[PDB]
Amino acid sequence: YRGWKHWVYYTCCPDTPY
Amino acid sequence: IRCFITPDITSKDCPNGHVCYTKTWCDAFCSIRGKRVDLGCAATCPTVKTGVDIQCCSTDNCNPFPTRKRP
Numbered sequence: 358y359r360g361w362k363h364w365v366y367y368t369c370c371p372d373t374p375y
Numbered sequence: 376i377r378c379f380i381t382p383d384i385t386s387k388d389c390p391n392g393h394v395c396y397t398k399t400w401c402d403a404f405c406s407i408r409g410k411r412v413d414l415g416c417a418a419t420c421p422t423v424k425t426g427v428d429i430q431c432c433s434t435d436n437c438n439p440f441p442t443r444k445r446p
Contacts, residue, residue, distance in 0.1 A: 366408045367443045368385035373408075 379414035379438040383407065389416025395437025397430025411443060 366373040377388040378395040396415030403426075413430050415437070423429035 364408065365385050366383070367411050368381060369444065370385070372386040373384045374386075 376416075377438070378416040380441065380443055382414055382416055389414075391418075392416030393418050394420070394431055394433045397428075397432060397437070399428030399430070401426055 363375040364373060365371065376392050378392045379397070381387070382389040392415070394415065394417070396417045397413030398415055398417070399412045413428065415431070420429070420431040423431055
């Protein structure tokens with residue numbers, strides 16, 4: 358748990374620059 | 376300036392842009408998640424070929440329908 362993602366790229370939710 | 380949906384990521388407008396540079400380039404591998412191909416925001420139409428499918432367009436709304444992933 359916790360460790361969600363720093364994964365999106367191509368829009369859906371916040372950013373992927375982290 | 377918002378040339379298409381978004382360059383690397385989701386959040387904002389390409390910080391570097393002039394023409395909707397629909398750049399379907401893989402370099403060799405294509406190391407980001409799974410690019411949804413061409414978006415642009417760069418300068419000129421200097422090559423547009425090789426293993427780089429570039430749909431460089433200087434239109435106003437180069438970004439047809441706000442669909443990214445879809446299903």
